[PDB]
Paper text:
Using a high-throughput, single-cell, screening methodology, we were able to recover a panel of 52 tau antibodies from the memory B cell compartment of healthy individuals between the ages of 18 and 66. Two antibodies, [name]-7.1 and [name]-22.1, were studied in more detail as representatives for antibodies with activity in the in vitro tau aggregate seeding assay binding to distinct regions of tau. Crystal structures of both [name]-7.1 and [name]-22.1 revealed multiple positively charged arginine and lysine residues in the combining sites that are likely to be important for the recognition of the phosphate groups in the phosphorylated peptide epitopes in tau, as in other structurally characterized anti-tau antibodies such as pT231/pS235_1 with phosphorylated peptide pT231/pS235, RB86 with phosphorylated peptide (416–430) and AT8 with phosphorylated peptide (202–209). Binding of both [name]-7.1 and [name]-22.1 was notably affected by ionic strength, which suggests that binding is stabilized by ionic interactions with involvement of phospho groups in both cases.
Author numbering:
A (entry chain H): 1 to 52, 52A, 53 to 82, 82A, 82B, 82C, 83 to 100, 100A, ...
B (entry chain L): 1 to 27, 27A, 27B, 27C, 27D, 27E, 28 to 214
Amino acid sequence: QVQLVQSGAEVKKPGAPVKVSCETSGYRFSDYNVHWVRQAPGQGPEWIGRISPNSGGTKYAQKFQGRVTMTRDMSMNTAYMELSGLRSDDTAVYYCVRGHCDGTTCSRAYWGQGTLVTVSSASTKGPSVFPLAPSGTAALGCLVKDYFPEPVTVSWNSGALTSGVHTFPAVLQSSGLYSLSSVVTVPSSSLGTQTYICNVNHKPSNTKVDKRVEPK
Amino acid sequence: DVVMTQSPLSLPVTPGEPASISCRSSQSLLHRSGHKYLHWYLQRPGQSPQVLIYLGSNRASGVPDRFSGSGSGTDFTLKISRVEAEDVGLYYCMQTLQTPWTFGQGTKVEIKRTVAAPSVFIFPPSDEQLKSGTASVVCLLNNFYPREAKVQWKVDNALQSGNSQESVTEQDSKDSTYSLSSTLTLSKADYEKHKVYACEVTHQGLSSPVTKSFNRGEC
């Protein structure tokens, strides 16, 4: 099976470089170009460039000339993208993409899962988790406050509770830290009997919290 | 370079109805191959975009035959024969005839359902947060349609302007509603100075605005 898997999320200060890897399996690495594409918040996708594995030859979009270096290691079937002089608007999800054609025939592309690169003066910080307490139908939730960078994941009752859950997009507070809420509606008849726990995970700070939410 | 021109930007459709998205290229995307190098994707936050149609008209495995692609040379269409609630999302065409690869503006498929009034909930700051020295008051607008809604915060009848942040979910893939969270931020000192906290909600489904409120510290 064709597989392209990228390195994990990155957080950088302005001016720093970032290097993202794209490890492949399940196909002849030398037969296809590897492209890199990014998508920034509120922007359309952008092609960054490509490398041809067999020759090492590179081609970059004008915008990234002198900023980006694409490489590859044949023995590892892996492509790399290094972007230097990062600015705030380099904040984006970056993708590697196996090209459509092998020089003889063409078919679909195969994409990596994406790598979030956050560029910011802010420093990594874990969230505080606060209950949004209830008291027919009741709403309850968790406030996940003052963390950096994105993302956090939130589940309810270790994934057993999904119906009626809404985890909202984070807002970037004026202090450079994020805040979000996750809510769920439940029967009031169950309050004080059925336990409701929000499972919060902020991997960048290695913060995992299971918070019970109880009526006031 | 190749310009890709996608239309419409927003596509509201009643479930059950067909839909069509157009994509125009500035030059033909044909025969350096046999193929038309035009592909259609569904954006999927958190993972790879989903290939729907590739090389003009080839439907990827797993994609419902409700979806189809056609076109020749410079004008292409992605067609959905019968739109379902789960089809909500952001769709792109893109060309790979040449590098740089280039992309359409994107089309947001929106499901047009009947009007649904929001169910409004208000949450005081938790004692836990207050002990930490901050106060967030949260107002929840649940399962409404259409998306347009106004939230106004009042603190002892003083209109709050600029002290709140809100965010909205994507359209629900089953019932096609939205939900919204608004957070009013105050210092604990300021929270303790006041009594009546009120979230006033304006929406098409409400004859008049609905206010949910609480009095600080009263069970």
